Structures are given as C-alpha cells and as structure tokens.
Amino acid sequence: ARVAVLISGTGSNLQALIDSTREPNSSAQIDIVISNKAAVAGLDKAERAGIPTRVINHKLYKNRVEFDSAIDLVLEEFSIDIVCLAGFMRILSGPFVQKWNGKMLNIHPSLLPSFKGSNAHEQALETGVTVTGCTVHFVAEDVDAGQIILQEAVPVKRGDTVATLSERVKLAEHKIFPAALQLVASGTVQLGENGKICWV
Ligand SMILES: Nc1nc2ccn(CCCCCc3ccc(C(=O)N[C@@H](CCC(=O)O)C(=O)O)s3)c2c(=O)[nH]1
Numbered sequence: 001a002r003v004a005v006l007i008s009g010t011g012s013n014l015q016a017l018i019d020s021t022r023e024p025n026s027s028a029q030i031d032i033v034i035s036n037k038a039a040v041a042g043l044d045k046a047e048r049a050g051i052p053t054r055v056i057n058h059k060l061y062k063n064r065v066e067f068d069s070a071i072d073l074v075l076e077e078f079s080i081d082i083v084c085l086a087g088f089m090r091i092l093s094g095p096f097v098q099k100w101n102g103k104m105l106n107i108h109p110s111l112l113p114s115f116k117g118s119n120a121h122e123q124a125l126e127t128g129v130t131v132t133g134c135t136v137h138f139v140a141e142d143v144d145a146g147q148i149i150l151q152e153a154v155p156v157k158r159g160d161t162v163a164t165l166s167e168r169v170k171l172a173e174h175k176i177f178p179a180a181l182q183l184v185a186s187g188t189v190q191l192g193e194n195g196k197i198c199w200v
C-alpha cells in the first residue's frame with residue numbers, strides 16, 4: 001500500500017511511521033510527505049529518509065476545496081492508496097474526506113470521544129482526568145463519525161503540563177499509529193459496508 005503522510009510540524013509521528021515502514025514485513029511504503037507549512041522539522045526527517053516532500057501552503061488558496069485539490073492532485077501524482085494525518089492542523093473539506101473515506105487515518109492525542117478538537121491535552125488537564133491516551137481513527141467529515149482503529153491509555157501524572165503530558169502520550173502514538181497503518185495497509189482492518197470497523 002502506497003502512503004502519503006500529511007504533517008504540519010515536528011513530525012515525530014512521521015518518523016515513527018518511517019521507521020516502521022522500513023521493516024521488511026511492512027505492508028506500507030511512504031511515497032510522499034506533504035506539509036502545509038514550510039521549514040517545519042518534519043520536512044527534514046522526510047528528506048533525511050529519502051522521501052519526496054511537497055509544501056502546499058493553505059494560506060495561498062481561496063477556500064479549503066481549492067487547497068484540498070492541490071493535495072489530492074499530489075496524491076494522484078504519487079498513486080497514493082492511504083493517507084496518514086500526522087500532526088496535520090488543517091480541517092479537510094467534505095468532498096475530500098468523502099473521496100478518501102476508509103483510506104485516511106489520523107492520530108489524535110486523546111481517548112476519543114473525549115477531548116475532540118485541537119487542544120486535547122489542555123482539555124484533559126482542565127478536566128482533571130487521571131487517564132488519557134491517543135486514538136488512531138479513520139477520518140470522517142467530523143471527528144465524531146471517524147471509526148476508531150486503535151487506542152492506548154496513558155496516565156496523567158500530578159503536576160503534568162501540556163509539555164510533559166504530550167511527551168508521554170507521544171510515546172504511545174508512535175506505537176499505535178504504525179500498528180494502525182500496518183493493519184489498514186495489510187487489509188486486516190477496513191471500513192465495512194456498515195461504515196463501522198471490520199476486522200478480517
Ligand atoms: N473534515 C475533517 N477534517 C480533518 C482534518 C483532521 N481531521 C481529524 C483530526 C481531528 C483533530 C482535531 C483538529 C484538527 C485540526 C483542527 C483545526 O482547528 N484546524 C484549523 C487551524 C487551527 C490552527 O492551527 O490555529 C483550521 O483548519 O481552520 S482541530 C479531520 C476530520 O476528522 N474531519
């Protein structure tokens with residue numbers, strides 16, 4: 001399965017995916033890394049690994065559909081089968097999400113459905129949970145319909161901040177995200193006709 005990784009920043013999840021896809025038994029190959037922001041560290045990791053990179057500045061487009069079209073064109077150029085969102089900070093348009101339904105994964109730093117949206121760690125700390133975690137799910141038009149592939153719980157320690165909590169959660173992301181990619185790329189997991197997760 002040919003994979004694109006969309007990033008917006010540091011790219012530690014990207015790096016975890018690169019490491020796992022270079023394993024002999026990997027069913028996924030990363031063929032293109034797309035950032036919406038230039039000069040982010042995730043682009044260096046991609047280039048260091050020999051993976052083509054494309055910057056597609058969302059700010060240069062009129063709306064999301066024009067921006068998403070630029071991305072979709074690169075995905076077609078590279079004959080992509082699967083799209084991993086790994087720190088991607090742009091909400092995607094409905095038709096794009098529809099087109100890639102059942103083919104686009106996302107890592108989210110909470111135990112969905114808890115703490116949706118952009119500041120999950122902030123919300124978790126404000127709420128005072130002692131257990132949080134991360135979630136790999138298929139992307140639907142809203143974070144609510146996205147079918148969940150894997151999750152891993154992570155403890156919240158007393159005194160945790162966004163910096164320390166996100167550091168601990170990221171260790172779990174770097175585990176379940178490569179595993180979830182391997183599950184989908186190998187055909188072991190897919191969206192069924194029900195639209196719910198199907199294990200083969
Ligand atoms: N249709 C759809 N699209 C996408 C893209 C990722 N996910 C799944 C990941 C869900 C994680 C939560 C969030 C991700 C991005 C957020 C956001 O607010 N982006 C602002 C810029 C904010 C900023 O950087 O200051 C914007 O795009 O305007 S929130 C989805 C999805 O499930 N459905």
Ligand SMILES: NCC(=O)N[C@@H]1O[C@H](COP(=O)([O-])[O-])[C@@H](O)[C@H]1O
Nearest residue numbers: 009010011012013014086087108109
């Ligand atoms: N909007 C979703 C979101 O906030 N996802 C989070 O962004 C980080 C990306 O880090 P990375 O660039 O080092 O992989 C990850 O911690 C991921 O859980």
